[PDB]
Amino acid sequence: TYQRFPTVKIRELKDDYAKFELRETDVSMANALRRVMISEVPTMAIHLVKIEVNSSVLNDEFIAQRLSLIPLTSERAMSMRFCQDCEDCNGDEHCEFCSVEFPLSAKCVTDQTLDVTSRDLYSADPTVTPVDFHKGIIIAKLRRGQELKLKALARKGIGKDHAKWSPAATVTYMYEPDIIINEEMMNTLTDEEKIDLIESSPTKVFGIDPVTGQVVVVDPEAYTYDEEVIKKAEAMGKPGLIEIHPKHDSFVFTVESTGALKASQLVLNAIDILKQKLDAIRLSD
Amino acid sequence: TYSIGQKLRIRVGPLKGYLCRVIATVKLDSQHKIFTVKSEHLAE
Amino acid sequence: EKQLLSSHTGQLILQMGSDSLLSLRVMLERVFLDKATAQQLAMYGSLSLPPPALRKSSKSGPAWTVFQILQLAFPERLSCKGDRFLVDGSDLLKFDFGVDAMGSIINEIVTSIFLEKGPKETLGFFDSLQPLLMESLFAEGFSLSLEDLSMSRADMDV
Amino acid sequence: EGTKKVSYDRDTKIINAASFTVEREDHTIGNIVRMQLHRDENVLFAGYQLPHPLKYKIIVRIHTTSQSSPMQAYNQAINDLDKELDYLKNQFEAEVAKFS
Amino acid sequence: IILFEDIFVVDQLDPDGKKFDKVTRVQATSHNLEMFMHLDVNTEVYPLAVGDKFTLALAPTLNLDGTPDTLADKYEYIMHGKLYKISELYVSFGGLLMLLKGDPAHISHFELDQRLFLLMRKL
Amino acid sequence: MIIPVRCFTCGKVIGNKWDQYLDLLQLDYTEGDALDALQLVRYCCRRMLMTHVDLIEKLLNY
Ligand SMILES: [Zn+2]
Ligand SMILES: [Zn+2]
């Protein structure tokens, strides 16, 4: 009987960015989306390296770490199976279901040094690849005669176990602002005072009129909720010339992704896993 | 069953696919934990 | 439960903590709370809170106060009578506010609670009051910026 | 483990109040539920607590009027929330399409 | 159901301030009754000027005769407290003190340690 | 040490950019008129580049 009815309205979308504007819901929903995106939407990334000839200057466990953090395309992530489940395997090598292996090999045999980048990781499922963006993520540098040869086993995980496996470079929201200027107290101020009210705003929300020379909010979106314009007013005397307070439905969310999962399908994928969560806590009867 | 010094694999568990070496009671290739597990949980 | 009375100073050795005092001060600064906030703090209490302080108003509905939260944090039955606070069955009557007298007041309160019932009741009261206060502050936040260390050039010349 | 994810324990002293323990959940679930339990007339008190900050378990307490039992409300909320999400999914999907 | 009814006029403000971040202990006097009453009220939500007229009522229960808390909706302001000292009336609404100087005849029906309510309305 | 793969605060992937920092800097770009054109905009991320000591060039030579 009681049920909110949220309503989205996207403003920019790309494969990495997305700025949608939810209206009509409680913050407790948006926070939940944030939180779950940051740390449940699953992704696939490397999780057991096995090295056979390191000759480089960097030790083995600094090659491992570095490898894991590399972002690996994982559209298939939600359909795999956390290894700890899959009982179709001993946990080694490709298992269509749970793991995908990535051999890498390099040895410098010239003079000028060879950057073992990431475009040199080759895989065997042609789905899980490394994400391409213009040259890739140096994993080591090798000088003549030095060699690296490794075989790795990717797996699927949730970013609450390590952040190798987390698909977001910051998701965040801003209670959209509501600004009301008293417009008659603001007639009291002399021109100068105004132009020292304008320019006490850290960002730029406010702005003078060409003509009437009145403060005219000119971008409500950019108001970090500092208290500066307000407190300058108090000091100038006139209190409450400007009062600015959160609207407490409208949010403006901004998701950005590591590239593993497109932005779109990060959000949709969150909503989906939330449902699957909720629908496990029903107490039946 | 097996013998001292063998290289086996942890089939099922939180530590799956890890390779380990059987001190007597297996020991992992690069971590300091000495775990003990039955034969059903170990593979070549 | 036996070394509470100090053989050196005579008062309870379980003195006040920095975070505890800070949270209590920033909580007493705002006498009235919201509905969801009040319910979320009581959760860490011991018993429920049937009666609300502020029933109906112009814009606010059921609004509680920090006094009832301290009451539900207090033991079941107690009678302090320390010339400044009265309690009768987990029902605080008055609570004075000052600059530093709150610490002495709560010290007298805990000493009376210890001498009346026992040490276990005081231990339970502390174990029920500490996480509640830690949670109260956490929502609010406290920090010091560069504005707090203001030179006030006029006062500087003075 | 297999202990039921959700468990119910009636509170003896106060009628129409009970506590539910949900294992393996945290503030993502608790805050969403709490705020919808507070959208209901019948419910009187609602909150969640983590028993210790380091253990993943939440305990949720609901006190309700005579008109509804605690269990009814809890279940109602979840159902309601789910239905909300579906509205959003549908909405989002519509928009992405439009953008393209 | 109402045990007491009286109209009070704002006589004086004890703290002599408006936004001192504390509850104001307003002092009022009765009309044609010669009774002085002190009360702590939240001024940020309920504005009160100097020398204002407002109605005040006492009620043990809001609904009909029976269990406390049909409901009185005429009073926009409400408080919950408990009387603790019959002798001058001394009642605190969960920390907010209230003092009365009424004659004993008009407040003879009050019992010790009872649950009461404070209904207030700005005429 | 070699540029870390991902910023340690927000997890952006910056480990792709070292070279184009340096290059741009070897034109005439104030750091920060460059770190902008590499499009890093939060300051958790403009740290990790402005404050990295390379140390692999050397470790290779010796
Ligand atoms: Zn498998
Ligand atoms: Zn960052």
Curated annotation (Swiss-Prot), chain A:
Belongs to the archaeal Rpo3/eukaryotic RPB3 RNA polymerase subunit family. GO terms for cellular component: RNA polymerase IV complex; RNA polymerase V complex. It comes from the Eukaryota. The keyword Hydrolase does not apply. NCBIfam families: PRK00783.1 (NF001988). InterPro entries: DNA-dir_RNA_pol_30-40kDasu_CS (IPR001514), DNA-dir_RNA_pol_insert (IPR011262), DNA-dir_RNA_pol_RpoA/D/Rpb3 (IPR011263), RBP11-like (IPR036603), RNAP_Rpo3/Rpb3/RPAC1 (IPR022842), RNApol_insert_sf (IPR036643), Rpo3/RPB3_RNA_Pol_subunit (IPR050518). Keywords: Acetylation, DNA-directed RNA polymerase, Nucleus, Transcription. One of its GO terms (molecular function) is DNA-directed RNA polymerase activity. This is DNA-directed RNA polymerases IV and V subunit 3B. The keyword Transcription applies. It comes from Arabidopsis thaliana (Mouse-ear cress). Pfam families: RNA_pol_A_bac, RNA_pol_L. PROSITE patterns: RNA_POL_D_30KD. Component of the RNA polymerase IV and V complexes. Interacts with NRPB11, SHH1, GRP23 and NRPD1.
From Swiss-Prot, chain C:
Transmembrane segments: none annotated. It is found in: Nucleus, Nucleolus. Mostly expressed in flowers, and, to a lower extent, in leaves. Present in sperm cells. Disruption phenotype: Blocked in the perpetuation of CNN, CG and CNG methylation in repeated endogenous DNA accompanied by a reduction in 24-nt siRNAs. Reduction of heterochromatin association into chromocenters, coincident with losses in cytosine methylation at pericentromeric 5S gene clusters and AtSN1 retroelements. Impaired RNA-directed DNA methylation-dependent (RdDM) silencing. Defective in the maintenance of post-transcriptional RNA silencing. Belongs to the RNA polymerase beta' chain family. WG/GW repeats are involved in AGO4 binding. Component of the RNA polymerase V complex. Interacts with NRPD4, NRPD2A, and (via C-terminus) with AGO4. Interacts with SUVH2. This is DNA-directed RNA polymerase V subunit 1. It comes from Arabidopsis thaliana (Mouse-ear cress). The chain holds residues 476 to 633 of 1976 of the full protein.
Swiss-Prot record, chain D:
Its main location: nucleus. SUPFAM superfamilies: RBP11-like subunits of RNA polymerase (SSF55257). Keywords: DNA-directed RNA polymerase, Nucleus, Transcription. One of its GO terms (cellular component) is RNA polymerase IV complex. GO terms for molecular function: DNA binding; DNA-directed RNA polymerase activity; protein dimerization activity. It comes from the Eukaryota. DNA-dependent RNA polymerase catalyzes the transcription of DNA into RNA using the four ribonucleoside triphosphates as substrates. Component of RNA polymerase II which synthesizes mRNA precursors and many functional non-coding RNAs. Pol II is the central component of the basal RNA polymerase II transcription machinery. It is composed of mobile elements that move relative to each other. NRPB11 is part of the core element with the central large cleft. Component of the RNA polymerase II, IV and V complexes. Interacts with NRPD1, NRPB3 and NRPE3B. Belongs to the archaeal Rpo11/eukaryotic RPB11/RPC19 RNA polymerase subunit family. This is DNA-directed RNA polymerases II, IV and V subunit 11. It comes from Arabidopsis thaliana (Mouse-ear cress). The lineage of its organism: Eukaryota, Viridiplantae, Streptophyta, Embryophyta, Tracheophyta. The gene is NRPB11.
UniProtKB/Swiss-Prot annotation, chain E:
Its main location: nucleus. Keywords: Nucleus. The keyword Nucleus applies. InterPro entries: NA-bd_OB-fold, RPABC3. SMART domains: RPOL8c. One of its GO terms (molecular function) is DNA-directed RNA polymerase activity. It holds the Pfam family RNA_pol_Rpb8. GO terms for cellular component: RNA polymerase II, core complex; RNA polymerase V complex. GO terms for biological process: DNA-templated transcription. Gene3D superfamilies: Nucleic acid-binding proteins. It is found in: Nucleus. Component of the RNA polymerase II and V complexes. Associates with the mediator complex. DNA-dependent RNA polymerase catalyzes the transcription of DNA into RNA using the four ribonucleoside triphosphates as substrates. Component of RNA polymerase II which synthesizes mRNA precursors and many functional non-coding RNAs. Pol II is the central component of the basal RNA polymerase II transcription machinery. It is composed of mobile elements that move relative to each other. Component of RNA polymerase V which mediates RNA-directed DNA methylation-dependent (RdDM) transcriptional gene silencing (TGS) of endogenous repeated sequences, including transposable elements. Belongs to the eukaryotic RPB8 RNA polymerase subunit family. This is DNA-directed RNA polymerases II and V subunit 8A. It comes from Arabidopsis thaliana (Mouse-ear cress). The gene is NRPB8A.
